[PDB]
Amino acid sequence: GRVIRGQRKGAGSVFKAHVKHRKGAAKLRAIDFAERNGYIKGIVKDIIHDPGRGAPLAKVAFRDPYRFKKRTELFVAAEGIHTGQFVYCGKKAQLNIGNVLPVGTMPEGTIVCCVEEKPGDRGKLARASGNYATVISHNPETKKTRVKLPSGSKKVISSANRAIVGVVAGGGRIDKPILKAGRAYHKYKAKRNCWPRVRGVAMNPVEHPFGGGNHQHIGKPSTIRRDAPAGRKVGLIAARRTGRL
RNA sequence: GCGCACCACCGGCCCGUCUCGCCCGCCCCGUCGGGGAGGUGGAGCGUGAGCGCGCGCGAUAGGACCCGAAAGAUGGUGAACUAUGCCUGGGCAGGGCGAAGCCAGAGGAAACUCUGGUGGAGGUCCGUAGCGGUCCUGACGUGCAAAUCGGUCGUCCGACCUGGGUAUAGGGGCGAAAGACUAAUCGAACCAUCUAGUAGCUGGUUCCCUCCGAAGUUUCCCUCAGGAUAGCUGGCGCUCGUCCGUCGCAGUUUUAUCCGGUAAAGCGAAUGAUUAGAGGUACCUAUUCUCAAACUUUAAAUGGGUAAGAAGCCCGGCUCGCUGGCUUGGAGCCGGGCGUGGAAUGCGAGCACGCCUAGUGGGCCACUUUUGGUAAGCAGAACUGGCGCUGCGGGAUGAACCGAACGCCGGGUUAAGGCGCCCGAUGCCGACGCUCAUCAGACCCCAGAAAAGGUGUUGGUUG
RNA sequence: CUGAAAAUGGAUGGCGCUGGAGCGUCGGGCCCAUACCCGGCCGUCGCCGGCGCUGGGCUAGGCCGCG
RNA sequence: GGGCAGGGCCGCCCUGGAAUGGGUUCGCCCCGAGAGAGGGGCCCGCGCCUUGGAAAGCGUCGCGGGCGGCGUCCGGUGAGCUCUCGCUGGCCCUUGAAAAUCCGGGGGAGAGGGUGUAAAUCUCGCGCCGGGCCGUACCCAUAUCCGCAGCAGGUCUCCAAGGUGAACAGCCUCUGGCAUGUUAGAACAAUGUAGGUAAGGGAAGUCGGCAAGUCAGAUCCGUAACUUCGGGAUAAGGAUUGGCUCUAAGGGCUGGCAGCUGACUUAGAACUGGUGCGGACCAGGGGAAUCCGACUGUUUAAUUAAAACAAAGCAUCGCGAAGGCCCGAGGCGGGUGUUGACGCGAUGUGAUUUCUGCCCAGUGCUCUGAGUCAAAGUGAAGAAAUUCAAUGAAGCGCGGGUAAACGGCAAGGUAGCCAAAUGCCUCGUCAUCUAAUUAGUGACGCGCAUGAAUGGAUGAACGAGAUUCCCACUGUCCCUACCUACUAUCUAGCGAAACCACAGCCAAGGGAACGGGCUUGGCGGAAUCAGCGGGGAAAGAAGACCCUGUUGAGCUUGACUCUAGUCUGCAACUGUGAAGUUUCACUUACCCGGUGAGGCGGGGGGCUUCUGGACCCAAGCGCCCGGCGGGCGCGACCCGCUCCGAGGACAGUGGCAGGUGGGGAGUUUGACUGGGGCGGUACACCUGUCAAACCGUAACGCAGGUGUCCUAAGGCGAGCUCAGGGAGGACAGAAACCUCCCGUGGAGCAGAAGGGCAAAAGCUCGCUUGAUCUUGAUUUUCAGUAUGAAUACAGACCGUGAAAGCGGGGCCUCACGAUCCUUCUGACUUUUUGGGUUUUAAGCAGGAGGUGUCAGAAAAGUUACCACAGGGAUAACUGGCUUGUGGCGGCCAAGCGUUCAUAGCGACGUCGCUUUUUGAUCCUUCGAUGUCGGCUCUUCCUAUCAUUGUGAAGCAGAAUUCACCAAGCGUUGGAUUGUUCACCCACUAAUAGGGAACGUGAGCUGGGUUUAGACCGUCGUGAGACAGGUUAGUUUUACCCUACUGAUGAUGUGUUGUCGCAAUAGUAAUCCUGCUCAGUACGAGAGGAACCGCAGGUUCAGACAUUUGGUGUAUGUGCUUGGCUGAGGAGCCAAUGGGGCGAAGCU
């Protein structure tokens, strides 16, 4: 049989991301001497909408600590910030919404976003609209902080991972029911070519493991193993359990 | 009498192997090497016949008599059609209902309600362009057109329509998913090559004449549309014979002697089935009715085997390690003597009916016999003939029936079948009867009749 | 003769036949098959075939004879 | 270019200060963060004027590339139409490009001259010079492009007049364009294609209201059930509509009410007419329900627009980046990812509302720590190869969880729902719907085989979806007719194609079982025209259906054998150190992240949180060099080995090993067979029979057996005699044991059967291992090969008996297996390759391990998405043989008929016929005979329902029954169903039965069936299947030959014409009612005829148009809409403008 739809996405021909009108990569500043030994004053110049993501992006401007240059960054806009606000980045910056602080220099239970997964990755965790990470506890011996991710998992990261205090703006976006199919079309028309999802039971056996039969049954158990080959790994991949929770 | 070649048979020898064994040899005396006797395995020996060349045929492997697949593989070319994403442009009358927001006037004790207007929302409605393509299953249907035309119809601010520029390439692409679409090609494109792919399967296979002439059956086969094998065929011969005579031969009789368990018969005989009384005391005896394919005491017809001499008979001896009371057997061998060849008839035989060998291995039909089946122009056997391979006369006609089989002709005579005319032959003064039919009847196979009836007519029988 | 009814118009073969061209029993005569008899020609096959002993003859791989 | 209108600054300026808040728009909006007002400023000014500039251009009048005259003017309006510039708002889980290029500002390093200039000057204003290369024609589409073409197809745009009207609708005209689309003339037949009308009835047509028609615009009214409150809705149902003549209402400007001036509409009224008025054009039929899908959207280009897909919603699953998912031959590869759980990826269900039950056994997924377990490694034995042992990963196994996982209902179908798109029986039962209903709806539910995200139930709105009814409408129909246009037709010119063995009149017979040719008959007359669709089993295509092939392909799995990927283990890359094979540490390989690798580590010295500003290119000091300039240091600490961090000898890499692996690859999926499959094994064997007296002899013939059993049930000897019966004998009996007698085997002999068998072959007993070691020959199946199983010897060694003898398995006939490979035994001058020794390996010989498809491949499906080679060797459709079955008819006479066998019947039996049932068969056809029904239409049969003429009765009349001559004539209209077949409603003289390739598809219709789409049920793990249901699904060609229908003509008697004859062929009328006979005959009554006669009708036939109706393009005459001809008048155009009436003709 021919390859399944799930296999053609890794080729990257028509399933690539629509990144034409995107305003840039949202990431923190480069970790320098100003943020490891003090703070640097920024200024929010504009809060823009990035096509593809439901969270706004802030165009924060900084001064280059070594050249007469205006460094403009693109952060994930925390909810509550506005244009004209002075945000600060570093370990000696105060605990305010929008400031970029290490996760080790903050009290427990601090709500932060855009958390660096590794020290200096310029922010990876909790960057979607309406999400945040909570600093659970610290460990001054190993210099490791334990953070609670939006998925409920508690990850032990380094205490030097910077993060933006607050919650990512654009929260409550999923609380609105998309009423039309056209609204869902425009939602993914900027993301990628994946919205109209034909059921595997509606296809033919050549195109999908679940296709075929005089009826549209699945036939085989929908719970597939983890080590299934590409082309058979459909349905519920490595499902620990099934049924209504 | 010497006997060629050849053949039957019996010795003999070589190698393997087996059984039983008592001798022998030596410088390299040993777990040494040799030989005997009797069976047996071998593509042996037994005073070579091969080799080279050419011709022909046969079975093969090669494109392999020619043409033909659905496929498979390697490499490559296509997104000018179309499917989808992206980029950059273009385009989308006139009307209907009329959402939030707003204004005003009212009602009310208050909360709050009501009315008018305004506003112009929406995968809204009618609908043009556009894009689609419902129904007529209309037109056309060797068309205008390898998908079009007309009316009608869907939608027409949206998941809308479209050009251009780009992206994805064949077991891949893409797919709001029809196995759709990917250049009139898609349940795996196109191009060239591998490739003259293979085919137990269809089709075809080119001059004349002479002579001979089949098989659809046996066994085996992942066989049953096919092969292998045996049979049937042809060719090539060869060994002899070829007046009587003698060898030899036979789809035949005769004589002699065996074999069988079918028809018929039997069950008052066995086994099995079965009817009715009778006698003696439900049985028991003697009877009685009806039967067998997997019953039988009996038992044919047809049919099968053998024999009908010289490879014999007769007389006299020899060999043996087998046999043994004893030449006692048995078999072999030797010498001599004896054709009236030791049934009829016909006939040339032999070489494992030699050597090579094509075709065939779908059969079919009839008398009789016979199985399944209500039956069948049904299915399945035995035997013989026939058709197929075969024309001819006759049955009007027709692969099989009847007669008879075939070079080219003349005369004659017939077969089966015919002789009113078609149509050769009764254009006999044929014989004897039978029969009237308002559906008469008119002859193998054979191509429509039954049970039951008639005071039609003609015979006969018993009263 | 009754019993005896199928669909295009039709099949002793047809015409037709009733002192028979019907049925049964027979007689004489007659008709013709590539069958049988005799004869011619052609070929094949078989002759323990014939001829080297010449008007003709014997290209013997020829000629001739017989069935 | 300049100037000025005009427009915009709710985005600017100054004054000032607001509530009695004001300003203001179509809408909004605006203001103490400052309104209103006044006065300014800026941007855009494509407008006007003007330089250009009228000299040119144009119109017109002249005159001779030109000369001239004159004119080119003054105005006024707008929801007008396009274009453009602004203002302002709405919508997005949609935020709707980059770069070249150009400009402004911040900063002030520097530059410039020392008293008139210098630096400098943004086209400031002018002057001077240069601007290369390529493309440029024309078509741009009913003839310049593509589709083989001058092809009714296709192919991206730009500009857009008047009238009507809401309109870029339709219709008419102007500018512009064209010649009717690759020909013309004549005629006006059939049949067509397109358009239209039709009286009376109104779906009776048909599978089905298919097609057609009705409705339609606007205005004023009136608008239910239901609902998600949005809708339904143009619901439905009504009225009005012309022309003309008026009235009233809705503005602006100027002057302070007056004057002037509109241009677009509404409302009311009068008059008027052949009641006609959205007059043409344009332009929804409606309602009551069921089924499915929520909707909009999308889909098989070229047969399926759907109930399919999608969809929002719902739910589940994976994953925190060293990741999930996926690509990839390969890398520090690539996609999602410019991403980060409100994310991405994988599925299921399918809006809302309402619920979503039970089962974790099976399969699958997932989660745990106590038998199996590879390579490597360790240990042991051995000369070594080798062998053995221990250890022993993942995975499996064990255990838990999981069903909005597959599924089922280990659990036994809960809530619901239903004879449903799902119910076999079935046309279920009941009610309703109709005169009549296999349909529809509402109910009933042990439901063949409903059922809950394999989703159950409901449901407004919506639908080119399926279905039922009603209203309205209509030529769908009763029942056809007429008119118009283009064809056909004829002529001029032009001019193909399919097809074709030869060809073309039939009946019957036979035949390859449906001839055109042969046979026997009928008979047959040139050359042709227009038609026609009976025939040529017509053409079109080496049947796609069925089967075969040791031919494939698509797809699927619990098929065979592999594989990418993935998991896991070992050593290598792989270093350092500590502690008890593990853990904590080290960095240095390796790995990841960040950055323009910008401040690291160790010492010394001593700094930014109020604001949408600004921030660099050292001030200062110290030192030094030049003739007013320049340089250096400090300012800004020193030193240093990895840029800084996160990992780290683990990830990872390469190489082996195990697991997993339809993701993928290759292949396979026996044969026989009254088609095939299913079943069976008739596939290797045995007995009886078939089998026809040797042997042999077939079928999916008949009745059975076999894949064993036996240390004796083998071998030998000896003794003994069985089954059963009679008579007896304590318990003891119909059967216990003892005795006698009879007992041809009637018992037994392992088994199926047959044969054989009595001091045997049976039974019992005691000695045994001839069931041993060998060679060859022979028999049977046979090819006379093998195997299997047998026969008779011989040579050994034994058993047994006193011995003769008997015995190398079973009393005989069945009870079994090649090569290769493995294993065992035995033997020897056997090999182990230059010799020797010992291991090992090989060989010889004999057994065993097994191929049951049994002379011996290694083997699951599915295909309707299918393909090829073929096959009438072989199925489904006709015909042919057969007639079991079906239908029909005799014979015999038990009996029925109150009595009486035969008026009418006919049991038990029995004989036939028919080919309108079905079956059987497989002869014809698979290089194709279109296949069900209906419609249409003709002819035929009689086994007569009715009519005609009769006979019979359990015939009084009437009605009816039976039978005869008899097929001339007729056998109907409807509901339901695709249906033939049934059933019912009526009508009728009767509503008889059949054939003709189950007549009739180049006649039709596609309803059924019968491709591909899709749903449901059952079934299968699955792909799929289902003669179960349901929905949508291309019906091609005649001009050829005959046949038939008509039309010319041909025929020979001289030509020609009129008037006739006539063979032969066709043939046609039919049934009924009323009245009278007649309330008569007959009968007790009730009832109730018949002949003649009479008046009409039904069906059919041939005509015909006086009349009535219909058509009507005499385009005849009126009316009228839109437009046009300046108006009237007269007319035209709108593919027949529409409508009224209408001659002739046809009907």
Ligand SMILES: [Mg+2]
């Ligand atoms: Mg599908």
Ligand SMILES: [Mg+2]
């Ligand atoms: Mg499936």
Ligand SMILES: [Mg+2]
């Ligand atoms: Mg299932």
Ligand SMILES: [Mg+2]
């Ligand atoms: Mg292959």
Ligand SMILES: [Mg+2]
């Ligand atoms: Mg509507």
Ligand SMILES: [Mg+2]
């Ligand atoms: Mg349209």
Ligand SMILES: [Mg+2]
């Ligand atoms: Mg169309």
Ligand SMILES: [Mg+2]
């Ligand atoms: Mg059509």
Ligand SMILES: [Mg+2]
């Ligand atoms: Mg046509």
Ligand SMILES: [Mg+2]
């Ligand atoms: Mg519509």
Ligand SMILES: [Mg+2]
């Ligand atoms: Mg494009």
Ligand SMILES: [Mg+2]
């Ligand atoms: Mg390739």
Ligand SMILES: [Mg+2]
């Ligand atoms: Mg399909």
Ligand SMILES: [Mg+2]
């Ligand atoms: Mg001959």
Ligand SMILES: [Mg+2]
């Ligand atoms: Mg034969």
Ligand SMILES: [Mg+2]
């Ligand atoms: Mg053949």
